[PDB]
Amino acid sequence: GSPNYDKWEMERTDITMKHKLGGGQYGEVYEGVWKKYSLTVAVKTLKEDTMEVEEFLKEAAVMKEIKHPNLVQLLGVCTREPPFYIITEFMTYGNLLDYLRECNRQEVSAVVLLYMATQISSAMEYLEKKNFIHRDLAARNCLVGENHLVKVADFGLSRLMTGDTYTAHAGAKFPIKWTAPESLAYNKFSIKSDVWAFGVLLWEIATYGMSPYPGIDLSQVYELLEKDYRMERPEGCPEKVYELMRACWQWNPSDRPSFAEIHQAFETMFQESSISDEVEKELG
Ligand SMILES: Cc1cn(-c2cc(NC(=O)c3ccc(C)c(/C=C/n4cnc5c(NC6CC6)ncnc54)c3)cc(C(F)(F)F)c2)cn1
Numbered sequence: 001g002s003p004n005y006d007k008w009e010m011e012r013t014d015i016t017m018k019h020k021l022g023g024g025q026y027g028e029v030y031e032g033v034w035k036k037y038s039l040t041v042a043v044k045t046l047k048e049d050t051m052e053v054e055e056f057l058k059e060a061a062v063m064k065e066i067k068h069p070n071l072v073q074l075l076g077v078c079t080r081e082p083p084f085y086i087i088t089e090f091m092t093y094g095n096l097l098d099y100l101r102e103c104n105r106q107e108v109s110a111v112v113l114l115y116m117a118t119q120i121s122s123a124m125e126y127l128e129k130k131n132f133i134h135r136d137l138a139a140r141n142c143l144v145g146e147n148h149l150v151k152v153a154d155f156g157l158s159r160l161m162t163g164d165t166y167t168a169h170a171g172a173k174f175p176i177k178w179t180a181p182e183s184l185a186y187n188k189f190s191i192k193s194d195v196w197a198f199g200v201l202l203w204e205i206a207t208y209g210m211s212p213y214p215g216i217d218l219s220q221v222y223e224l225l226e227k228d229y230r231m232e233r234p235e236g237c238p239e240k241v242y243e244l245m246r247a248c249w250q251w252n253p254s255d256r257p258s259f260a261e262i263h264q265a266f267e268t269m270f271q272e273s274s275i276s277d278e279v280e281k282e283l284g
Pocket of ligand 1: 021022029043055094143155
């Protein structure tokens with residue numbers, strides 16, 4: 001309502017900054033509170049005025065355009081000067097990989113695993129409509145809130161997260177075990193390489209957060225995929241869900257389903273599982 005108004009910009013002093021989240025493995029992300037509204041938030045910060053600002057501002061610009069119940073929601077930015085902030089809603093249960101690894105399986109039961117996949121595929125159907133290619137879909141980049149609410153996020157983890165997850169490839173660092181063959185071979189990323197990664201994420205969900213391709217060296221993964229090797233069906237994984245994994249891992253990207261198709265399939269399976277679950281709960 002005045003000349004320098006920007007509807008997304010907030011004053012840094014609006015936010016109480018608290019501790020760093022993720023132990024450094026997730027970069028410069030902090031818990032905060034939006035004081036005026038007594039609301040816990042998460043805040044990504046960039047302290048210095050360097051070339052890193054270009055990607056930080058690109059991230060903020062994308063987040064202003066995307067909005068969906070299962071995408072982490074932008075609340076505001078501080079991008080007029082350093083230190084730069086991106087402020088989002090707070091997801092109380094943290095990243096999905098550790099959630100799965102730490103959960104009570106009587107609570108996070110078969111129907112909840114389907115619910116998780118359904119929510120993620122709904123977010124990805126939306127990103128497919130926007131034609132936003134995520135490039136690093138994996139359980140480590142999803143977040144969990146109350147009542148098993150799951151949202152897709154992106155923490156730009158490839159040079160933050162240490163260990164075997166990301167390794168040197170094509171002058172960058174790739175999560176080899178989530179990467180579609182044509183992305184490994186030709187650096188070709190697309191909605192269909194996100195579909196491949198979603199299939200790996202389904203396997204992470206089915207195994208309560210196991211690392212993929214167990215015991216297989218990173219150096220061998222591409223060669224094996226090219227011979228048509230694919231991960232086996234996890235114990236307890238429904239056949240229909242494994243069929244969807246295998247569809248996501250079609251060698252030719254054009255042969256992989258769309259996220260619209262994937263989401264419809266999961267919504268159907270989830271509603272069926274929910275009926276059985278509600279009946280079982282009602283009994284006693
Ligand atoms: C270049 C570029 C990047 N992108 C792109 C960026 C994003 N950015 C974020 O996701 C994002 C941004 C900023 C922040 C503060 C956060 C953190 C949120 N957060 C909420 N609860 C927690 C939390 N709870 C634990 C209990 C403590 N622990 C840690 N973090 C937490 C997440 C998302 C997407 C997507 F995927 F398309 F949506 C695309 C687009 N072009």
